[PDB]
Amino acid sequence: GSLDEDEEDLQRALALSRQEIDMEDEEADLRRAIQLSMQGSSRNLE
């Protein structure tokens, strides 16, 4: 039950999209979304 296994590729995809965008304007919002995802924050606000 290695969850980290999938998370390795998941954060890989995140880093992948990081270099895909890497643009500090409008895409910077998507960039911030990767950061948000890396913060482990989903729809679990309340």
Side-chain angles (χ1 to χ4, degrees):
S2 186
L3 302 176
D4 301 79
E5 186 59 66
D6 295 290
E7 282 174 70
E8 285 293 310
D9 186 86
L10 194 283
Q11 66 183 31
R12 182 281 310 189
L14 295 177
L16 192 152
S17 301
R18 283 182 57 141
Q19 52 97 329
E20 287 192 284
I21 284 70
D22 207 282
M23 199 64 58
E24 311 300 281
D25 46 80
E26 203 284 289
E27 296 182 80
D29 184 78
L30 292 73
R31 174 103 144 180
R32 199 181 191 216
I34 274 68
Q35 183 184 150
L36 174 280
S37 305
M38 191 177 180
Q39 299 181 271
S41 305
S42 307
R43 52 84 185 241
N44 301 331
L45 299 179
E46 301 180 79

